[PDB]
Amino acid sequence: IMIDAASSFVLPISITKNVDVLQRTDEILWFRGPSVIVNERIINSGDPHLSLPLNRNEKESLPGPFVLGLRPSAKFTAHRLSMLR
Amino acid sequence: NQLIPQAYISNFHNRLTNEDDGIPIFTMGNAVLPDLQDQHHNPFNILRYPKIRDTFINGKVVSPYRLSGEAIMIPITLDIEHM
């Protein structure tokens, strides 16, 4: 199992006309596999949607993925911006 | 490392034959020397002065030469043509 493969490639034709949105070298970088989209980085480790307790067929349409991601409440953020100045 | 040795430059004869310095021994900011101006502890800054890269470029390496009740003073003149 090797480590030092290249795994990125560049085509010789300068097509740099409509490409300011992609990832440029500074040309266009062309990798050997796709990307990986990760929804939320921090798992919410309790929350019986995920913990599955052993007590007591049901569906639930939760709002967004933001339930599973430890977001702070806004009153603390306003308190901290008041503590800013 | 990065330290200048303490000796081994004797650029004196080229200033004797510089023809800008008014030395009568031979015939054939806005300051000039940084003896009042700091250089913020880089020696490379002293290479901006035009009489000092003269003594690093045109210098050489020298080897050190090694060695009554009333004084009577006598003046001695010296006048020799040579080449």
């Binding site: 290249a6 990125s8 490639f9 085509l11 034709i13 | 330290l3 020696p43 490379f44 290479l47």
Partner: peptide
């Protein structure tokens, strides 16, 4: 376009780790 072999970018591991960024240490004329 299907005959357009691409150029590998090699990383050369010792370049990736610790490369810094000689006359500017004044001891060598």
């Amino acid at each position: 376009f299907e005959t357009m072999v691409a150029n590998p970018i090699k990383v050369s591991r010792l370049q990736s780790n610790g490369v810094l960024t000689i006359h500017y240490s004044l001891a060598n004329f």
